Amino acid sequence: VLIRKEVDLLSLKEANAIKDALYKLQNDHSKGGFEEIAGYHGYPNKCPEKGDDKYPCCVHGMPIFPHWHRLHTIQMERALKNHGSQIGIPYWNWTKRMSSIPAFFGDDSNNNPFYKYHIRAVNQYTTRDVDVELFNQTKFGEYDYLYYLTLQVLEENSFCDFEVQYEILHNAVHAWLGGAGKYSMSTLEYSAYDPVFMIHHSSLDRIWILWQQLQKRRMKPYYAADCAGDLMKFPMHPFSYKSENEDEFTRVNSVPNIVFDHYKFNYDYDNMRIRGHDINELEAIINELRNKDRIFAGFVLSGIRITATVKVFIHGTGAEHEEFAGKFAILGGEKEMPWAYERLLKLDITDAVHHLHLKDEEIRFRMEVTYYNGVPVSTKLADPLIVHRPAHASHDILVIPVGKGHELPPKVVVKSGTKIEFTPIDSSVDRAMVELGSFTAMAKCIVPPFTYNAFELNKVYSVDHGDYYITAGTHELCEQNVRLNVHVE
Amino acid sequence: VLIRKEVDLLSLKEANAIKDALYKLQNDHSKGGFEEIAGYHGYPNKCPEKGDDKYPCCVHGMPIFPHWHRLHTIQMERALKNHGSQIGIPYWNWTKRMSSIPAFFGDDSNNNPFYKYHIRAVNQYTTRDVDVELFNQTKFGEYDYLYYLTLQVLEENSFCDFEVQYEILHNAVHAWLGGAGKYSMSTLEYSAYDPVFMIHHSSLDRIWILWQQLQKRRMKPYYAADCAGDLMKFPMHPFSYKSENEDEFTRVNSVPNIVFDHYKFNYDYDNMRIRGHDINELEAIINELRNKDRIFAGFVLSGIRITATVKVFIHGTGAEHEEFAGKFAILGGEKEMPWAYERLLKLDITDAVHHLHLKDEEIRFRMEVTYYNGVPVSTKLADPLIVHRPAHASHDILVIPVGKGHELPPKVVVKSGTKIEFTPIDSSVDRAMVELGSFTAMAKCIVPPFTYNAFELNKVYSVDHGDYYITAGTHELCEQNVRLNVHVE
């Protein structure tokens, strides 16, 4: 019964009514008030439930990220209803062309409750530092940044791969709203205190529902996950804590497998259009995207304990011409749960690769990783792999540069029928990669003095199912980073 | 139709007839003769089939070891039939009490073809150097060594765990017959040229068939494997090589999933008794073994590139009294395929543990690893884990000492409902182990500054299914050996 409307479609009467509910909610000091419910997410760190060894509860970098933030938005939405709201939490279609922030939350006049919040526990107001690139975005060919990343989400047809693209898209808006401020959307510890937090996650949830609709029409799964399955079964925190959640309906219904189905929670959206496009038009756009070759930088990411922007530059094999290829954001915090996607975040680099006339095996990378506050990030990112998606292909080609001391993702999960190809980044790798057949043989670099289950350099191989424990053809190289686990379907 | 008889039950007429067939076979220089078929196994290294990067074909340390050696014995058996034999390959029940080697192959008189073989390609006679401990075995309580290891095989009720005990049992006879000689049963490269090789593997195959019968009566699998399933589907080498196998029936039927069923190959045994015990008596003996607590040293082994004997000594936590606890053999070769059981070889140490009055968490280990030729082995074995099997228990308790610089198995596979317990071997480990949730988090030692999915020290936990990526509670300790993957059912 609670309809979520786009912020610019709210009537004056509706905007004022929900603003009045938020004011009442923000002035509610109980476990049902704004400060306590926002506190589910990061500061003050509400988990184990009792213990004094506390850490932020929100799930990121993991397959239940969407469920966690879906339920958090539901929690805030029911709290606003308990304080008089008659509508759902409004959303912001941040895929649209834009020259300013919507007034509903960007206009401070008349003590707008959605403009900022005074965090009582730390005696700080939330801040924003809006990156004007929002109004002037880079393009992937014809498509503006945020809109293209949203199309990339909708192209995915399996849940755990969807989730990576979904979360990285959502990270961009966090970074672009929050900027350098600690008590901002940039920070896992404090982002949930900005009233725009709930609007952004109401926007993101709409994309998840749209994806679920696409999956239904594809006859692919939309109410179950293809990974982390044991974990989909456990109630989420702190929603399940009696000391922390006075909303019994959400406390009882906090299991991700339940949260898959949003209809159980009595909300819907005014419309599902992106850039004026209904689902039929989006299906046609997604199909158009299959008509040309695409090349991606495939990042296999793990946690870095601080929010940062990754800028990606490419160059060919000689000492010559470097081009900026794109960027994305990673959220993080010093007390974050350890996370590792083990799946590819695909940054489309097609136009830079073509401009530099590089063949797949020639693409080399350089990253600048900078925290939200300008501090350089010391945690090293592995270089991305090269993902080649031919025009109308059913399977991607994963191109993997290897060399002594060149870090690989420890593990990457790929669809059955994915093709892979190893190529040397320097002359240290001068014989075929080998498949050792076990975790232990790879960990101990038990590599035989002969060629064995070989992946010849610069040859393409299809992988079908199971685990591949691939290393360089010598023990010493295997001990110098040249090994990884390819896990298939 | 080909009956395999115990060597001491052969009539004089039968022994002479099969000896005449072996003589003819040994003098056959073709691809169907003794030297070429024995050459399947190690020297001269017959695989890839064409390539000049050759290595020995026999599968060891892997789940298809039994299939490979079953088919090899079938290959030799059909070759002997093609040279006039009317019986199967005889076997030697080496579980029996014994004061000498059976005359059928241990008596050199009258140019006995089974006594030794002249390897034409290297111009060497096979040698034996029989360890007289065969006639004077250590005991596990009341049970002599080889007989007890055979009972341990028959106790297993799942295939990949069966296979570890099965192969380690078979290794003991290799080491005890071969001794220090290079051209002996001690060596993967040359053992197959000793005519006793086929007799030993005819003995071992009988135990596999007996186990398959037990599994049938248990309504547990006996024609399929519970691991390495993709690999059970591919034809074995060099049996599938046209240039190497003129026996079309074995060439076509070389897939392990087919070889599971020995009836397809038209042989059987005169009887299945061990130590005079039929299968009903063995079931009662196996049940008796469940009546008392047992403690095992659980070795999780990987390849060491040479045949060796492992001697195991235990002592408690202080500087005091050490006791010899048992020993076993590992076969190997410099060109062996890389292998890793990732499952527990259980060496029963109950009596030494009780003699020293040690609690589970106090048991400490020292190994002496010595190659068949007396050279000390430089490849380090991880210390075994401690396996506690309470009297009538359905699940084992795995006790895992941990500490800075103390090597663990990289991965261990255990049955669902196995209990595990971590205990510090020194004070470096002074907070709970943690479960990180991914291969990558473990590989990169992404350990959070708080307690997380904790395994408290000296507490017992049951594990149910899936993968556990367990590390010490600090990044630096995780980087100093204190991590492992526990893979469940």
Ligand SMILES: OC[C@H]1O[C@H](O)[C@@H](O)[C@@H](O)[C@@H]1O
């Ligand atoms: O002038 C620099 C800047 O100007 C405008 O804002 C846009 O056209 C941007 O793309 C460009 O980067």
Ligand SMILES: OC[C@H]1O[C@H](O)[C@@H](O)[C@@H](O)[C@@H]1O
């Ligand atoms: O005398 C040493 C030696 O003697 C006999 O052979 C047996 O009783 C052995 O167990 C013992 O080790």
Ligand SMILES: [Cu+2]
């Ligand atoms: Cu969050």
Ligand SMILES: [Cu+2]
């Ligand atoms: Cu968020």
Ligand SMILES: [Cu+2]
């Ligand atoms: Cu062998």
Ligand SMILES: [Cu+2]
């Ligand atoms: Cu053998």
Ligand SMILES: [O-]
């Ligand atoms: O978030």
Ligand SMILES: [O-]
């Ligand atoms: O063997």
